[PDB]
Design a protein around this motif. Structure first.
Motif, PDB file in Angstrom:
ATOM      1  N   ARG A 101      38.733  18.866  39.699  1.00 31.62           N
ATOM      2  CA  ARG A 101      39.982  19.614  39.343  1.00 31.62           C
ATOM      3  C   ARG A 101      39.931  20.879  40.197  1.00 31.62           C
ATOM      4  N   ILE A 102      40.540  20.950  41.414  1.00 25.24           N
ATOM      5  CA  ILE A 102      40.297  22.048  42.406  1.00 25.24           C
ATOM      6  C   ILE A 102      40.721  23.341  41.716  1.00 25.24           C
ATOM      7  N   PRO A 103      39.998  24.464  41.725  1.00 21.13           N
ATOM      8  CA  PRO A 103      40.364  25.735  41.122  1.00 21.13           C
ATOM      9  C   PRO A 103      41.848  26.208  41.348  1.00 21.13           C
ATOM     10  N   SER A 104      42.336  26.980  40.351  1.00 19.15           N
ATOM     11  CA  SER A 104      43.642  27.564  40.448  1.00 19.15           C
ATOM     12  C   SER A 104      43.524  28.933  39.723  1.00 19.15           C
ATOM     13  N   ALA A 105      44.463  29.869  40.112  1.00 18.74           N
ATOM     14  CA  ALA A 105      44.567  31.277  39.764  1.00 18.74           C
ATOM     15  C   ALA A 105      43.488  32.081  40.519  1.00 18.74           C
ATOM     16  N   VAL A 106      42.776  31.367  41.436  1.00 16.86           N
ATOM     17  CA  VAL A 106      41.722  31.841  42.257  1.00 16.86           C
ATOM     18  C   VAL A 106      40.452  31.912  41.462  1.00 16.86           C
ATOM     19  N   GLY A 107      39.664  30.778  41.356  1.00 17.61           N
ATOM     20  CA  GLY A 107      38.294  30.698  40.946  1.00 17.61           C
ATOM     21  C   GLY A 107      38.273  30.279  39.499  1.00 17.61           C
ATOM     22  N   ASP A 138      36.499  45.809  35.485  1.00 17.98           N
ATOM     23  CA  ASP A 138      37.208  46.788  34.752  1.00 17.98           C
ATOM     24  C   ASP A 138      38.776  46.856  35.028  1.00 17.98           C
ATOM     25  N   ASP A 139      39.304  45.786  35.677  1.00 18.76           N
ATOM     26  CA  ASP A 139      40.648  45.750  36.111  1.00 18.76           C
ATOM     27  C   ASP A 139      41.352  44.630  35.273  1.00 18.76           C
ATOM     28  N   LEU A 140      42.453  44.948  34.534  1.00 18.04           N
ATOM     29  CA  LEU A 140      43.075  44.149  33.587  1.00 18.04           C
ATOM     30  C   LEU A 140      44.450  43.615  34.078  1.00 18.04           C
ATOM     31  N   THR A 141      44.699  43.815  35.412  1.00 23.21           N
ATOM     32  CA  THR A 141      45.842  43.289  36.120  1.00 23.21           C
ATOM     33  C   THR A 141      45.395  42.032  36.956  1.00 23.21           C
ATOM     34  N   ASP A 142      44.235  41.518  36.651  1.00 23.38           N
ATOM     35  CA  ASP A 142      43.579  40.301  37.215  1.00 23.38           C
ATOM     36  C   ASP A 142      44.000  39.159  36.282  1.00 23.38           C
ATOM     37  N   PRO A 143      44.293  37.900  36.792  1.00 29.03           N
ATOM     38  CA  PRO A 143      44.972  36.719  36.183  1.00 29.03           C
ATOM     39  C   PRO A 143      44.260  36.172  34.966  1.00 29.03           C
ATOM     40  N   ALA A 144      42.895  36.193  34.908  1.00 25.54           N
ATOM     41  CA  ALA A 144      42.188  35.760  33.753  1.00 25.54           C
ATOM     42  C   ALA A 144      42.377  36.579  32.529  1.00 25.54           C
ATOM     43  N   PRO A 145      42.323  37.935  32.489  1.00 22.12           N
ATOM     44  CA  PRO A 145      42.731  38.639  31.327  1.00 22.12           C
ATOM     45  C   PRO A 145      44.188  38.616  31.033  1.00 22.12           C
ATOM     46  N   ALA A 146      45.017  38.648  32.163  1.00 20.39           N
ATOM     47  CA  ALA A 146      46.480  38.746  31.910  1.00 20.39           C
ATOM     48  C   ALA A 146      47.093  37.619  31.179  1.00 20.39           C
ATOM     49  N   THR A 147      46.607  36.355  31.346  1.00 21.11           N
ATOM     50  CA  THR A 147      47.047  35.109  30.737  1.00 21.11           C
ATOM     51  C   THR A 147      46.738  35.176  29.280  1.00 21.11           C
ATOM     52  N   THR A 148      45.563  35.726  29.001  1.00 21.68           N
ATOM     53  CA  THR A 148      45.060  35.876  27.665  1.00 21.68           C
ATOM     54  C   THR A 148      45.753  36.847  26.757  1.00 21.68           C
ATOM     55  N   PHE A 149      46.303  37.908  27.388  1.00 20.12           N
ATOM     56  CA  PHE A 149      46.944  39.023  26.775  1.00 20.12           C
ATOM     57  C   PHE A 149      48.096  38.473  26.007  1.00 20.12           C
ATOM     58  N   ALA A 150      48.762  37.381  26.530  1.00 20.75           N
ATOM     59  CA  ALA A 150      49.928  36.733  25.986  1.00 20.75           C
ATOM     60  C   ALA A 150      49.520  36.018  24.738  1.00 20.75           C
ATOM     61  N   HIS A 151      48.314  35.321  24.762  1.00 16.51           N
ATOM     62  CA  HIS A 151      47.767  34.424  23.776  1.00 16.51           C
ATOM     63  C   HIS A 151      47.285  35.228  22.531  1.00 16.51           C
TER      64      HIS A 151
END
Lengths: 52, 120
Positions: free
Chosen positions: B35-41, B76-89
């Motif tokens: 399953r090739i990575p997506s959202a970068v890594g 320490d950066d919360l504008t990165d895709p892994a936390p941002a997706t979660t923020f919604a959840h």
């Protein structure tokens, strides 16, 4: 000096009172421990009902 | 917790720790399963794995399972895709930071960045 002394009279009154009053506090905490046990029994009663 | 909630009819005050290890774990076996990575890594199945997880933890016709989940923000950066997706959840976010903790202000929760969707 008369003013300062008068005050010292009153310190002697007020400690005599605190003994009685403090004693009253311990008596109050004794009945309170029985109150805490009413909360528990009342809580349990509720719990059986909810599960049924 | 589901067993509590439905069959044995009791509220749970669930706690999970650290739920980034759950995200990071899926990312490791994601590449190798093909399953090739997506959202970068990251796993391309990030939304749905979260989604499934979060819906189980809820209030229904009986029990109310209210989770407190730790979350790790990388770099320490919360504008990165892994936390941002979660923020919604997540319903009731808080934000914490190195600076506030060091200043002597306990906890390091920020005053304007602590936000709920349950605040009315």
């Amino acid at each position: 000096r008369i003013d300062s002394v008068s005050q010292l009279q009153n310190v002697a009154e007020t400690t005599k009172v605190l003994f009685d009053v403090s004693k009253e506090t311990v008596e109050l905490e004794s009945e309170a421990f029985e109150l805490k046990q009413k909360v528990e029994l009342a809580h349990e009663a509720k719990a059986v009902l909810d599960s049924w | 917790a589901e067993y509590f909630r439905d069959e044995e009819g009791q509220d749970v005050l669930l706690f999970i720790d650290n739920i980034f290890r759950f995200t990071q774990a899926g990312s490791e076996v994601s590449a190798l399963l093909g399953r090739i990575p997506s959202a970068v890594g990251y796993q391309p199945t990030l939304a749905t794995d979260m989604g499934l997880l979060q819906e189980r933890i809820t209030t229904t016709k009986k029990g109310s399972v209210t989770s407190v989940q730790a979350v790790y923000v990388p770099a320490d950066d919360l504008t990165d895709p892994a936390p941002a997706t979660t923020f919604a959840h997540l319903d009731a976010t808080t934000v914490l930071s190195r600076g506030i903790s060091e200043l002597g202000i306990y906890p390091a929760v920020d005053p304007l960045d602590s936000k709920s969707r349950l605040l009315d």
